[PDB]
């Protein structure tokens, strides 16, 4: 119930490294929760915002949107979570009252997004003070800190037995891939699937396709060093566009005799998205867009590709309804139905957080986990 | 069983009028049917091919792909249809054996399309002789003639009580609109729908939406003279893009509080297709492409429109399985469930066939019916 002094990794300008500093964190107001972050993961959109390319970037700011922790304080009006619980913050809440929350077809809650995009709590202010300045929040969580304040609808409650040093990855990547495979596509047994890109999201998609029951899975990438891991996750074969003179969709059409049944696009390249649409089977093919492109880029095609059967669709947070569905995923990981331990490729300490970004800049890791205690 | 002399409307070069001539029609070979055309309808793709803009146009050729008639002769191996029957030719057959015919998700049979696109019968030759030249077939039917020869899988058998002078329209237009409404979209009661363009296909789509059970229907067009008929078919309101300074998708978003549930695009303009995608509701919107664009045009959008929920899909022949589904549509018209008599706007004789095209060039008619006897 009093201001907490803690250590954070603040960013001050676009394109500069993060600097470790001491910050003051205010007590939560009505309908808010204070969380001590235990572990976190460094995602790609964090580095994208840090670079400064985002037209909506606001500085100074504390990044991070993947982590798990333990509750200390709750505001006035909270009757759902008490101190000592193990929880996961979420950048897609679930109020349960709006028109988007009563529709089973969607999961895009639209209650606090106007303040979340500006970097402020729902009341209209920020809880982070540094040397007489106010530091904005990032994507509603801000987990690059030892303590953080979030809204009461952005918190999911998990089993206390879960290891918090690895279950944190179920915030952005593994959940998105698994949901893309088993929610937005809903693929029947015996299908043929193709995955573009073999990062964290691609490997999660491959895992979901193998779990659901597809017979043949094709992995596509321009870096050979990934192929090995793909074959461990369930991909039957892997190809490289640079080894063929013909365009990639023609290679896939020749290989699969007509085209694949499902194609997942997990990169963020508009040309790859067009190639992914044109490689689906005529009559019943489906293409799912998972990655996010830079602002100002357009994906083109001819309407003759849609008239003869094919479909575009897209997914955000794998289509899961976050608050009521993340606990089920943690339970699934308890039963060894899905793989979480095989995604983490590196471990760092808090002070070396900058090093994490450099690894992401080189393409040598899938996911890195930072221990914040 | 002998060559038949008949009257036809042959085209000799791109951009010239059709000329009425006398032709010889050969007896059918194995797995073929000879039909005496009674009535026909002039569609938009006929005039498109006649203009010469089609990169695949081949001349001389006999156009037409909508009509009903009576059988005279059948080839060797036909045990399904006998002479005197009332039938409808179809530009999408149904063999029932290929991989596309055993899949309930599609209706694009791929058995005789290679010869159909070239203008020849499956054996490899044409049955139309004129003054020592061979005349190719059009879209597998060629109904601008008093007698025509078609394959045995391109014929649907209907109730003999049907009036053949109006049931012919169930070949291309009304079927496509009705199927787009109730097959590819599958819209639930209480939905909001928007239709772009108010020709024959647009009015069929409106009829299907009203039958299925949507509550609110919005018609969009740039010609005011159409709006009246739309209000008779079930459209609740109609708008004109030229009356507003803002782009049309913003007008629709403001009007419907977020966007429509379903949007059908029935024109063939790539800019209208983009505007139709951007006017669907966030989270659960769907956009169905029905019209065909000119070769070399691309429809563009940003992937942020697909990531947040929306979908493109397309339809050819309304998704009906032609041979087994057209008789059901004729039965539906017998019970007054659907409207066929309200589409025909003009009637002509065979010799005035050219006049029909001129009407289509002015936008004063929905469908014109030519009586061929
Ligand atoms: N919509 C969502 O909810 C959501 C969630 C998480 C991530 N994402 C996005 O998914 C994308 C993947 O991110 P990530 O960190 O999981 O993996 P990553 O971006 O680090 O890996 C990208 C892979 O694509 C390959 N690549 C580059 N150009 C290629 C080309 N022409 N052809 C084939 N491969 C090419 C690269 O070699 C690489 O293996 C990102 O853009 C991310 O923003 C979206
Ligand atoms: N895929 C299929 O199976 C199939 C079947 C039949 C027809 N079609 C196609 O459907 C299209 C419609 O053909 P039709 O004969 O039924 O009607 P039509 O083409 O004669 O009517 C077109 C209407 O769109 C309007 N238009 C032009 N520009 C516009 C704009 N910017 N905004 C709004 N309206 C505009 C016109 O005023 C007109 O009312 C055609 O392109 C046809 O080729 C497709
Ligand atoms: C565009 C956007 C901005 C923010 C922000 N903070 O600026 C947050 C979310 C989104 N965004 C929306 C629009 C807003 C929206 O629909 N919703 C629903 C509940 S609240 C909310 O954000 C749809 C999809 C996304 C999205 C963006 C990035 C990632 N991504 C990439 C890598 N890692 C994460 C995943 C999804
Ligand atoms: C591109 C095409 C050419 C021909 C031809 N004769 O050149 C015939 C059909 C198509 N086409 C296909 C590819 C081929 C195909 O999938 N199939 C399935 C069974 S056979 C066959 O044609 C998919 C959709 C269409 C199509 C084209 C025009 C119209 N349209 C417009 C106005 N009025 C009619 C409707 C559909
Ligand atoms: Zn909500
Ligand atoms: Zn992320
Ligand atoms: Zn078939
Ligand atoms: Zn037609």
Curated annotation (Swiss-Prot), chains A, B:
Q: What EC class does the entry list?
A: oxidoreductase
Q: Where does Zn(2+) 2 bind?
A: 95, 98, 101, 109
Q: Which residues bind Zn(2+) 1?
A: 43, 65, 172
Q: How cofactor binds (record note)? A: Binds 2 Zn(2+) ions per subunit.
* Biological process according to GO: fatty acid omega-oxidation; formaldehyde catabolic process; positive regulation of blood pressure; respiratory system process; response to lipopolysaccharide; response to nitrosative stress; response to redox state; retinoid metabolic process
List residues modified as N6-succinyllysine: 231, 313
Task: Cite the Pfam families for this sequence.
Answer: ADH_N, ADH_zinc_N
Kindly state which keywords UniProt assigns to this record, in alphabetical order.
Answer: Acetylation, Cytoplasm, Disease variant, Dwarfism, Intellectual disability, Lipid metabolism, Metal-binding, NAD, Oxidoreductase, Phosphoprotein, Zinc
What SUPFAM superfamilies has UniProt attached to this entry?
A: GroES-like, NAD(P)-binding Rossmann-fold domains
Can you list the GO cellular component terms from the UniProt entry? cytosol; extracellular exosome; mitochondrion
The residues annotated as site (Important for FDH activity and activation by fatty acids) are 113
Query: What S-S linkages are listed for this chain?
Result: none
Q: Where in the cell is it found?
A: Cytoplasm
Spell out the note in the miscellaneous section: There are 7 different ADH's isozymes in human: three belongs to class-I: alpha, beta, and gamma, one to class-II: pi, one to class-III: chi, one to class-IV: ADH7 and one to class-V: ADH6.
> Which family does the UniProt entry place this protein in?
Belongs to the zinc-containing alcohol dehydrogenase family. Class-III subfamily.
Q: Which medical condition is this protein associated with?
A: AMED syndrome, digenic: A form of bone marrow failure syndrome, a heterogeneous group of life-threatening disorders characterized by hematopoietic defects in association with a range of variable extra-hematopoietic manifestations. AMEDS is an autosomal recessive, digenic form characterized by childhood onset of bone marrow failure resulting in aplastic anemia, in association with global developmental delay, intellectual disability, and poor overall growth with short stature.
Q: Output this protein's name.
A: Alcohol dehydrogenase class-3
What is the originating organism of this protein?
A: Homo sapiens
């Amino acid at each position: 119930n009093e201001v907490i002094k803690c250590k954070a990794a603040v960013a001050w300008e676009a394109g500069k490294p993060l600097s470790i500093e001491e910050i003051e964190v205010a007590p939560p107001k009505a309908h808010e929760v204070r969380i001590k972050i235990i572990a976190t993961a460094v995602c790609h959109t964090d580095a994208y915002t840090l670079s400064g390319a985002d037209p909506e970037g606001c500085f100074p700011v504390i990044l991070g949107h993947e982590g798990a922790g333990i509750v200390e304080s709750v505001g006035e009006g909270v009757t759902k979570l008490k101190a000592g619980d193990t929880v996961i913050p979420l950048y897609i809440p679930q109020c349960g009252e709006c028109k988007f929350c009563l529709n089973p077809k969607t999961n895009l809650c639209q209650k606090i997004r106007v303040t979340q995009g500006k970097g402020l709590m729902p009341d209209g202010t920020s809880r982070f003070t540094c040397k007489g300045k106010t530091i904005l929040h990032y994507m509603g969580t801000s987990t690059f800190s030892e303590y953080t304040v979030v809204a009461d609808i952005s918190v999911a409650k998990i089993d206390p037995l879960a290891p918090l040093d690895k279950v944190c990855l179920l915030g952005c990547g593994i959940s998105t891939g698994y949901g893309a495979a088993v929610n937005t596509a809903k693929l029947e047994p015996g299908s043929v699937c193709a995955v573009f890109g073999l990062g964290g999201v691609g490997l999660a998609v491959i895992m979901g396709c193998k779990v659901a029951g597809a017979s043949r899975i094709i992995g596509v990438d321009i870096n050979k060093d990934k192929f090995a891991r793909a074959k461990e996750f369930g991909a039957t074969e892997c190809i490289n566009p640079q080894d063929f003179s013909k365009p990639i969709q023609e290679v896939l059409i020749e290989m699969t005799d007509g085209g694949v049944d499902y194609s997942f696009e997990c990169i963020g390249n508009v040309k790859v998205m067009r190639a992914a649409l044109e490689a689906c089977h005529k009559g019943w093919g489906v293409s799912v867009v998972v990655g996010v492109a830079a602002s100002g880029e357009e994906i083109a095609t001819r309407p003759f590709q849609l008239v003869t059967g094919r479909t575009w669709k897209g997914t955000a947070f794998g289509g899961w309804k976050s608050v009521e569905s993340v606990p089920k995923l943690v339970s699934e990981y308890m039963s060894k139905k899905i793989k979480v331990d095989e995604f983490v490729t590196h471990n760092l300490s808090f002070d070396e957080i900058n090093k994490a970004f450099e690894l992401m800049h080189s393409g040598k890791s899938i996911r890195t986990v930072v221990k914040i205690e």
